[PDB]
Amino acid sequence: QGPTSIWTKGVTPPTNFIEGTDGSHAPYIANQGWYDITKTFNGKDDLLSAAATAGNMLHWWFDQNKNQIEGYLTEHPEKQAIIFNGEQMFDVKEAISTKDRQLDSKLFEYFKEKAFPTLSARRRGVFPDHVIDMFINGYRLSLDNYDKTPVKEGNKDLRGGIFDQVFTRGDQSKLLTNRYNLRTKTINEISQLIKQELIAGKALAISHTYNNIGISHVINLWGADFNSEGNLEAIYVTDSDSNASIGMKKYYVGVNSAGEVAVSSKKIDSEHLGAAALGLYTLSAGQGIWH
């Protein structure tokens, strides 16, 4: 009969929550284990919600794997930088140094400027698991694939494969990502999945319907509140579309009038149907796998 709460491994719950114009938010504080990559809307990042979300999860991943990554980069120093012909496009140490920045992290800068510079202009986006599977394992990110990454040997995507000397292509046990359909699932099914993935020590992203830019939006899910019945009541999220001053938002979770498990900055109501939950993406730290 008590309302229990569960946070992502290595994240300090914010407590600075203030009433805003639409719902409760906790402005971002550095070095608390969560991340809030924020779009500038510069032409290039406008439709990269998924790449921002993947970036936030990769920032979290850098924290989980700090020692393992510094070990790896000494054993394989050629994997530190990415070069296209003559030019250094990316340096992973630069990404790690700048991981605390909402607006000007080198990781999101790489994504919007070098990896996916044309996708926004072409009214196109990505899936956050594809971005991670590219960045870590070197799996080729295809604009034609709307399902999971095909787990098969193949050429390193030139835009990534930094950790592909440990997290190889075509080996299921070295795949760190997963995705789950939430559409038409019950509050109990969605709640147990999110519970399980959080207690398992995964980073989480959730997609919901969007009544604007695209049709779906993906955000980072850092924490959840579960009621007396074990069902989600609220989630704590960062949203790349929210300006840098917002930070962590509290969304109510419930079953709306239309029978959808929905998220809303306001309590689910006869007057507030929120946005339908569509998908869940997870990232493992992969701590079994190093060495």
Author numbering: 46 to 336
Authors' account:
In this work, we describe a novel protease of S. canis, termed IdeC (Immunoglobulin G degrading enzyme of S. canis), which may be involved in bacterial immune evasion. We demonstrated IdeC is a cysteine protease that cleaves feline, canine, and human IgG between the hinge and CH2 regions, defining a new virulence determinant for S. canis. The structure of IdeC presents the α/β fold characteristic of the papain superfamily of cysteine proteases, consisting of an α-helix followed by an antiparallel β-sheet comprised of four/five β-strands. The active site, the canonical catalytic triad for papain-like cysteine peptidases (Cys-His-Asn/Gln/Asp/Glu), is situated at the interface and involves residues from both domains.
To enhance crystal quality, a truncated form of the inactive IdeC was produced in which the first 48 residues were removed (IdeC_T48_C94S). Crystallization experiments with the truncated IdeC produced new crystals in the cubic P 21 3 space group that allowed the structural determination of this variant at 2.25 Å resolution. No sulfate ion was found in the IdeC_C94S_T48 active site, which may account for the different conformations of the PBL. In the IdeC_C94S_T48 structure, the PBL is stabilized by polar interactions involving the main chains of His253, Tyr255, Ile260, His262, Ala320, and Ala321, as well as with the side chains of Thr254, Tyr244, and His262. Additional structural differences between both structures were noted in loops 63–69, 186–194, 226–231, 301–304, and 309–323 and in residues 125–137, which form a small β-sheet (β−3 and β−4) in the truncated IdeC structure. Minor changes were observed between residues 86–89, 160–163, and in α−2. Similarly, we conducted crystallographic experiments with the truncated form of IdeC and the IgG-Fc. Unfortunately, only crystals of IdeC alone were obtained.
